[PDB]
Amino acid sequence: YYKEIAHALFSALFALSELYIAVRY
Amino acid sequence: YYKEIAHALFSALFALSELYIAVRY
Numbered sequence: 001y002y003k004e005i006a007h008a009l010f011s012a013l014f015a016l017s018e019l020y021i022a023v024r025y
Numbered sequence: 026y027y028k029e030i031a032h033a034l035f036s037a038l039f040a041l042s043e044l045y046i047a048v049r050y
Contacts, residue, residue, distance in 0.1 A: 018037075
């Protein structure tokens with residue numbers, strides 16, 4: 001049940017990061 | 026520059042969505 005949440009939190013961070021980068025860089 | 030942010034926020038919200046599901050459902 002958490003194996004998904006781990007991967008869910010995984011992609012959540014990667015997309016937010018790329019969003020952050022795209023705004024200022 | 027603008028469209029780069031959109032597609033990122035796009036991907037951001039989806040990643041965020043999937044994360045909310047894995048926790049509540």
